[PDB]
Amino acid sequence: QPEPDMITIFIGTWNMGNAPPPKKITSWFLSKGQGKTRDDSADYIPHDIYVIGTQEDPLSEKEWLEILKHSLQEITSVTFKTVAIHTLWNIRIVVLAKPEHENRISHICTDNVKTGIANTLGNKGAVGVSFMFNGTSLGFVNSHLTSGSEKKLRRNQNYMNILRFLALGDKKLSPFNITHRFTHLFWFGDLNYRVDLPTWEAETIIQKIKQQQYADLLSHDQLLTERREQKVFLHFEEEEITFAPTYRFERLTRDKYAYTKQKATGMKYNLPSWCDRVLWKSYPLVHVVCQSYGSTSDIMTSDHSPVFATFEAGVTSQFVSKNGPGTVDSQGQIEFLRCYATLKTKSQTKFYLEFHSSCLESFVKSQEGENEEGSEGELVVKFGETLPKLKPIISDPEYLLDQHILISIKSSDSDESYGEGCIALRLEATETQLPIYTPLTHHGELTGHFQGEIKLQTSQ
Numbered sequence: 287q288p289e290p291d292m293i294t295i296f297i298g299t300w301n302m303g304n305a306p307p308p309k310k311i312t313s314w315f316l317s318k319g320q321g322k323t324r325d326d327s328a329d330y331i332p333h334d335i336y337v338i339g340t341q342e343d344p345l346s347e348k349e350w351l352e353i354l355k356h357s358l359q360e361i362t363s364v365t366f367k368t369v370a371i372h373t374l375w376n377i378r379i380v381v382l383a384k385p386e387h388e389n390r391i392s393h394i395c396t397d398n399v400k401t402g403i404a405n406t407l408g409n410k411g412a413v414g415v416s417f418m419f420n421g422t423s424l425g426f427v428n429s430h431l432t433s434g435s436e437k438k439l440r441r442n443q444n445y446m447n448i449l450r451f452l453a454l455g456d457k458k459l460s461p462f463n464i465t466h467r468f469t470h471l472f473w474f475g476d477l478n479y480r481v482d483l484p485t486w487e488a489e490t491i492i493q494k495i496k497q498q499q500y501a502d503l504l505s506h507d508q509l510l511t512e513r514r515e516q517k518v519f520l521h522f523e524e525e526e527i528t529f530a531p532t533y534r535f536e537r538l539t540r541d542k543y544a545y546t547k548q549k550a551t552g553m554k555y556n557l558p559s560w561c562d563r564v565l566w567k568s569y570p571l572v573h574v575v576c577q578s579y580g581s582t583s584d585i586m587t588s589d590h591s592p593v594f595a596t597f598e599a600g601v602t603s604q605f606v607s608k609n610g611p612g613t614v615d616s617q618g619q620i621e622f623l624r625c626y627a628t629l630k631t632k633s634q635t636k637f638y639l640e641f642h643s644s645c646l647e648s649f650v651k652s653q654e655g656e657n658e659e660g661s662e663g664e665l666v667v668k669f670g671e672t673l674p675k676l677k678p679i680i681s682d683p684e685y686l687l688d689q690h691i692l693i694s695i696k697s698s699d700s701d702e703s704y705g706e707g708c709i710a711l712r713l714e715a716t717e718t719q720l721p722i723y724t725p726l727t728h729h730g731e732l733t734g735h736f737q738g739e740i741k742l743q744t745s746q
């Protein structure tokens with residue numbers, strides 16, 4: 287039975303509005319409704335992994351697991367295995383997998399982050415799950431961010447707290463936050479970004495939605511504008527939105543948006559918005575293709591509609607050679623040549639690098655680089671040809687060309703990371719000096735760049 291080189295992943299996000307679901311929710315798992323929808327001919331084909339994020343979820347874990355598993359069984363005739371379930375307050379993530387994947391899945395981690403302080407602590411935050419699928423690390427974050435049209439900056443702060451403090455994946459990757467720990471990271475939820483138009487334009491907005499004319503609304507979507515100004519979700523992707531705003535509906539129909547201020551809303555307007563979103567970030571040159579992104583039309587218990595997204599994701603096998611794991615394979619080497627970091631910092635410490643990769647027995651620390659001034663005010667840290675030659679555990683190009691090297695640049699004075707990035711080993715050539723590049727971030731914000739050349743030796 288061959289190991290897969292591709293899987294499909296279902297991501298669902300639904301703010302349930304503290305109401306039990308209706309008896310049938312199969313349309314959600316089938317990616318049927320509005321937007322980019324799944325072909326009818328696929329309906330019986332199970333996804334490999336289903337990741338369900340809920341917010342304002344009133345059900346027990348048991349109650350929801352029963353509804354989810356019976357739903358999928360009705361669709362596919364497959365009894366899914368529960369990989370993980372984690373709940374913070376009324377924010378929940380469930381991961382289900384086909385039974386054939388049970389002995390492909392390991393290193394299951396769960397965590398949560400509570401956002402805000404005192405007043406603003408006690409209902410918003412995030413839950414997450416990570417695991418290994420054979421040789422591929424997968425991370426999943428379900429976040430319910432701060433509500434309200436005038437709180438986009440709070441949402442951005444919530445995002446940074448979640449990616450700083452959510453403890454998923456390999457704890458040995460100590461300089462790296464969740465935005466660098468996974469081959470594929472999916473981040474979804476009620477992100478609560480709104481369409482930033484005047485309140486007086488509510489009926490105009492509804493008109494546009496009824497005509498399926500989303501362009502002038504999307505140009506005011508706070509998540510798209512904030513992402514374009516690099517305020518949030520730097521280096522994440524989102525499929526094009528081709529479905530109606532998923533909030534705020536009158537319950538038990540989808541024919542009415544309930545946008546007017548009410549005591550129950552704290553006298554806030556809720557103009558129709560795309561609150562409910564799915565974003566991802568995969569390591570460079572790994573296959574990831576969005577195959578659906580849309581909302582259901584027929585699930586109306588909540589003031590939100592469910593959102594679905596599906597993906598093809600490249601995966602690798604758990605590689606064994608005569609040599610590694612358990613030793614290095616002397617036919618393999620990675621050389622980083624003529625590299626330099628360009629940093630936005632004003633600090634005047636020396637810097638060293640750390641190289642982290644599951645193709646190494648353990649992480650590798652460099653010597654200190656040489657600091658110079660850039661022409662436009664910047665710090666440039668030069669490493670020359672001084673960098674340690676990296677010794678991978680397996681030399682086979684079928685393994686090594688699929689790997690990645692995480693880079694941290696750290697202060698000699700404090701050992702703290704000033705920037706993190708990732709380099710793919712999916713090169714155009716081996717035994718050939720080739721340009722490499724990664725932006726560097728810290729707490730998910732741009733802090734600089736790393737560039738240079740690489741020369742990769744494999745057993746071929």
Ligand SMILES: CN1CCN(C(=O)Nc2ccc(F)cc2)CC1
Binds near residue numbers: 369383391
């Ligand atoms: C800490 N433990 C280790 C064993 N364990 C597990 O193996 N779960 C699993 C479930 C479903 C699946 F598909 C694969 C693995 C539960 C957590």
